[PDB]
């Protein structure tokens, strides 16, 4: 399974350094595999920020796909958002690789197709329900609770998601 | 005017690459002005990194004054914030560079201090008049919305930021 590891290396590499920093070197040691061991699966660099960034779009749709099947089953909104939410937060693998890339998205126009594949489709799955308005509302919320938490050091409580997230949805 | 350039191409660079990422090439790029430039302005690449830092301190500074300033007629705070965001969003030309210097805090902790600023400030003037949960939950809105517009390209408009923000305050 060396060159799935690779893929992923590099999916930590161009979160931290852009799709421009990404090197055969820097996946390398992220990977903890030789050099020449990159060069054999990806030695068009290219190639390897296509696969990363499918890697990583594959993980959004999908994790957006559970998130689904979550709402689906719980009558409570705002409680299963939030325990969602703190997932999300909590998540040290891949989870936090998805959400640095998507950070890091903000201010580099080449990751911003991948990025937008999470507010378009939360959006899309919150609209049905809650309105455009909250839906666009909620979404916000969530970039600004994963954002705040790692800026501040402190994230919020899974409770004060909850309130603050059926205050945006509760009907005016 | 070049200098000034120079400082915040400086803000970027440290944005991505880090405190010890600074160097001539990488600012040069980044302010598309000579090497020539940068080594007339700042034969020290530790003088460029203060006056970065400098900088993004102040402007910081600036920012909570001038928030404070409108929030000091202790009327209409919904929409008084709302307004100050939709400012702050519209002005990429002002603080898209200072914007992406917080943000990289998010994943680099030697730029907490520096960004811990804001939302610290915020809080300040926010919390006596409206409680640490509300005041929180404003300051991670504020940060969502922040994110939200870059990633997706559009602000949330006034109008939804006020309706937004009155939810998060209203008293529970």
Redesign the interface.
């Known amino acids: 399974g060396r060159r799935q590891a690779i893929v992923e290396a590099a999916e930590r590499v161009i979160?931290?350094?852009?799709l421009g920093?990404l090197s055969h070197r820097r996946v390398a040691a992220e990977a903890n595999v030789p050099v020449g061991s990159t060069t054999y699966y990806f030695n068009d660099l290219d190639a390897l920020r296509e696969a990363a960034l499918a890697h990583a779009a594959n993980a959004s749709a999908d994790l957006l796909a559970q998130w689904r099947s979550d709402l689906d089953k719980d009558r409570d909104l705002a409680a299963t958002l939030a325990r969602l939410t703190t997932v999300y937060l909590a998540d040290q693998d891949r989870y936090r690789t998805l959400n640095?890339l998507?950070?890091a998205?903000?201010?580099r126009p080449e990751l911003?197709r991948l990025?937008?594949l999470w507010?378009?489709g939360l959006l899309a799955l919150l609209e049905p329900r809650i309105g455009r308005?909250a839906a666009?509302?909620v979404?916000?919320?969530?970039?600004?609770?994963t954002?705040?938490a790692?800026?501040?050091?402190t994230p919020?409580s899974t409770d004060?998601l909850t309130?603050?997230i059926a205050?945006?949805v509760?009907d005016?």
Do not use: C, S
């Open positions: 979160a931290r350094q852009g920093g640095e998507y950070m998205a903000a201010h911003q990025a937008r507010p378009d308005r666009n509302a979404t916000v919320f969530f970039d600004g609770a954002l705040h790692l800026i501040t050091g919020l004060e309130d603050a205050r945006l509760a005016g």
